[PDB]
Amino acid sequence: PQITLWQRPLVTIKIGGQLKEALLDTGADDTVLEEMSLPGRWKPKMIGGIGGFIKVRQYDQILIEICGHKAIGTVLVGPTPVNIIGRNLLTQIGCTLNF
Amino acid sequence: PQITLWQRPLVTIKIGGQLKEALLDTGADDTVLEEMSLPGRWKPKMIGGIGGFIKVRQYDQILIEICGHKAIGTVLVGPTPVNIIGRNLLTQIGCTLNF
Numbered sequence A, B: 001p002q003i004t005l006w007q008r009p010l011v012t013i014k015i016g017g018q019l020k021e022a023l024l025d026t027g028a029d030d031t032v033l034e035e036m037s038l039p040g041r042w043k044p045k046m047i048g049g050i051g052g053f054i055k056v057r058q059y060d061q062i063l064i065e066i067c068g069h070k071a072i073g074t075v076l077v078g079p080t081p082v083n084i085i086g087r088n089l090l091t092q093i094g095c096t097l098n099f
């Protein structure tokens, strides 16, 4: 699809059999979701935001649907303002910027 | 132009007669630039994201030129770790997300 930016680019994702609202963020190198439960082991990760770096859990090879596009990648879990879908997954669904 | 997301979508901008590199961020409501001088009146503002909030100065009706495209809008100046072009300006240059 083509998404304009007059409002927040919010879309429905599906992870762990559940639906959530997430923001397509080309400015985010990674994908970080609000506190939740994911399977397997996780690793430590420091992501830097507008106000500093925070601690987050890193799970790899996680299944996640974005606007019907199935993707499998790294998903970070932590205290983010909103669910953020980053470049690591935006590149998997073939998302590009255009003007 | 069409910009991919394999790498951060950084572009050149011209503001206040100065050339700068900035990050096209669809996950950004506003445009915030690193410490610099801008013309006119300003009002203090607090913006937040991963890591928390930072204090910035808000200047309105500021001219900007992104990849040759002239635009007008609000610009925030403060301790941001990277120059960021927010949705408030991306819309003016006709920028959209496609996949």
Ligand SMILES: COC(=O)N[C@H](C(=O)NN(Cc1ccc(Br)cc1)C[C@@](O)(Cc1ccccc1)C(=O)N[C@H]1c2ccccc2C[C@H]1O)C(C)(C)C
Pocket (backbone or CB within 6 Å): A008, A023, A025, A027, A028, A029, A030, A031, A032, A047, A048, A049, A050, A081, A082, A084, A086, B023, B025, B027, B028, B029, B030, B031, B032, B047, B048, B049, B050, B081, B082, B084, B086
């Ligand atoms: C209403 O408030 C706002 O619009 N604030 C904006 C904002 O903070 N944007 N979002 C966060 C956010 C998204 C949606 C909503 Br709803 C609210 C906040 C994040 C950001 O793109 C900015 C950023 C980019 C580069 C360096 C540092 C920070 C970011 O944090 N990027 C990092 C990131 C995120 C997840 C995983 C890894 C990494 C690494 C880096 O790419 C504003 C302050 C620019 C205006």
